[PDB]
Ligand binder design. Structure first.
Ligand SMILES: Nc1ncnc2c1ncn2[C@@H]1O[C@H](COP(=O)(O)O)[C@@H](OP(=O)(O)O)[C@H]1O
Ligand SMILES: CC(C)NC[C@@H]1CCc2cc(CO)c([N+](=O)[O-])cc2N1
Length: 246
């Protein structure tokens, strides 16, 4: 197995649904942050080391390529942070892999990002996220890797992540740069709600008969998950309330 599809879209742009859609198309696993959080938390330190490598005056690109290849062994595709920030490196490693850019209205994205991925440092909800994440064993090292991977996608070192205006413009700039870098024939821009048709044509497959395009990972569902993790202090005791998600 080798990487066939590189998902360059940012978190909260429908990447979990695209993960599920690609697993339906190929019948093989697709990487996502959920893989890190719920299956392979040991990958957190590996990703951190690759992000740190990019900060060096002279980064070891072959160390990065091998780290990515090792991380993605057994996967047919990748989506979401932190992998999306490495889409250029992945394009080089997998010259035959096609690129997806999942995209959505920027104001809806920012709202979703603030409720799940990157709340403001003064937002009381941040403490609820953290208490719920402790049930999952997620600690401060995860937040550092996640934040660092987002800054790396935005190609900025010193950035005020609490400024909505700055995030909105980083969002647009990131999406614009993907379209500039990736050749058109190699890129599909998939807007939220687009469904199977464009995706399956791009990938040279038929539309899955009788199987609807996935619709998963809403911020309402993540808020409910946080509150149930805090209330019951166990993922196993609550997993039945979130069918088909993890
Ligand atoms: N088929 C679909 N149609 C419309 N929205 C979808 C969708 N699949 C996922 N989404 C939305 O995409 C966001 C999750 O993306 P990701 O998996 O990258 O984190 C959620 O937005 P909201 O948080 O606004 O509900 C989710 O509702
Ligand atoms: C339940 C909650 C309290 N924590 C678990 C959630 C699971 C979804 C999720 C997705 C991303 C990016 O897809 C990030 N991220 O980039 O940090 C964090 C989280 N966290």
């Amino acid at each position: 197995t080798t990487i066939q599809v590189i998902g360059a879209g940012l978190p909260r742009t429908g990447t979990n649904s695209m993960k599920k859609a690609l697993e339906i198309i190929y019948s093989k696993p697709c990487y996502h942050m959920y893989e890190i959080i719920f299956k392979k938390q040991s990958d957190i330190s590996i990703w951190q080391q690759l992000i740190d490598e990019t900060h060096k005056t002279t980064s070891d690109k072959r160390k990065i390529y091998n780290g990515l290849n090792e991380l993605l062994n057994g996967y047919i595709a990748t989506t979401d942070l932190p992998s999306c920030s490495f889409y250029k490196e992945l394009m080089t490693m997998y010259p035959n892999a096609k690129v997806l850019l999942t995209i959505r209205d920027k104001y809806d994205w920012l709202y979703s990002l603030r409720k799940v991925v990157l709340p403001k440092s003064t937002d009381p909800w941040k403490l609820k996220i953290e208490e719920g994440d402790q049930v999952l064993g997620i600690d401060s090292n995860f937040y550092k890797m996640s934040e660092d991977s987002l800054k790396f996608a935005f190609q900025k070192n010193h950035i005020n992540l609490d400024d909505d205006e700055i995030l909105l413009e980083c969002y647009d700039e990131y999406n614009r740069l993907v379209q500039e870098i990736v050749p058109p024939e190699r890129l599909l821009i998939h807007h939220l709600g687009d469904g199977w048709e464009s995706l399956c044509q791009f990938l040279n497959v038929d539309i899955p008969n009788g199987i609807s395009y996935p619709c998963a990972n809403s911020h309402h569902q993540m808020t409910q998950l946080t509150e149930q993790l805090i209330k019951h202090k166990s993922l196993d005791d609550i997993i039945h309330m979130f069918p088909g998600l993890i």
